[PDB]
């Protein structure tokens, strides 16, 4: 049964810290406690160890990513830009 209407993961925070703050931290909590897919083995076992450190439970392979997500849009756009610049330099 649906236990709560609005509050989800931040239901553990009770009636404290303010509605806006709890709403803002809810998405980050979900993203950082979600399990991702290992782009090396394909199993959905990519967990967060600490801030910026992501580890796969099966490969035992660790990847340096983002604080609250596995990868950041800044990182992916920098990777694309770097690839394009390499291609430009080598023509």
């Amino acid at each position: 049964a649906k236990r709560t209407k609005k509050v989800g993961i931040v239901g553990k925070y009770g009636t404290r810290y303010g509605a806006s703050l709890r709403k803002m931290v809810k998405k980050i909590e979900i993203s950082q406690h979600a399990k991702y897919t290992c782009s090396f083995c394909g199993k959905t076992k990519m967990k967060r160890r600490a801030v910026g450190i992501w580890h796969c439970g099966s490969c035992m392979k660790t990847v340096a990513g983002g604080a609250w997500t596995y990868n950041t849009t800044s990182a992916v756009t920098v990777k694309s830009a770097i690839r394009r610049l390499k291609e430009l330099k080598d023509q």
Binding site: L21, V63, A64, A67, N71, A75, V78, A81, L88
Partner: protein
């Protein structure tokens, strides 16, 4: 402890004697254990590698920039920060870079710099909700937290 960005432990082999030299880097985004990273003047330009700013094309995103040659990295080394190569001056051997604070600085093109952006971006996004979290944050840094007006 005390630093938001993670660190990478990279193993090289001494070119002058039978040994293996272990070094600790500032981890850039997308680097994984077991990856190969190449350091030098003629290492290809891709995420992770370190090479002098005088050889990368302008518009390159750079982390752990080296402020003076030989200094071994001083600039743009906090979580989520980076620097950008702006323009080259082939004579006088200088290049212009944009620091994460927005200032534009001129450096010698003979100094190394990691390619990419420091891992652990968006750490400031999550609000510390309680004095407990703030206390645990500053306990690993220094005695400065409970500021009295």
């Amino acid at each position: 402890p005390g630093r938001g960005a993670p660190l990478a432990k990279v193993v090289f082999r001494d070119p002058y004697r039978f040994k293996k030299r272990t070094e600790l880097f500032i981890a850039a985004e997308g680097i994984h254990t077991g990856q190969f990273v190449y350091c030098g003047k003629k290492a290809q330009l891709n995420i992770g590698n370190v090479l002098p700013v005088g050889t990368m094309p302008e518009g390159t995103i750079v982390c752990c920039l080296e402020e003076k040659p030989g200094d071994r990295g001083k600039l743009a080394r906090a979580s989520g920060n980076y620097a950008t190569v702006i323009s080259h001056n082939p004579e006088t051997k200088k290049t212009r870079v944009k620091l994460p604070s927005g200032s534009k600085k001129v450096i010698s093109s003979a100094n190394r710099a990691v390619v990419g952006v420091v891992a652990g971006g968006g750490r400031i996004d999550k609000p510390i909700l309680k004095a407990g979290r703030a206390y645990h944050k500053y306990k690993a840094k220094r005695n400065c937290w409970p500021r009295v007006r």
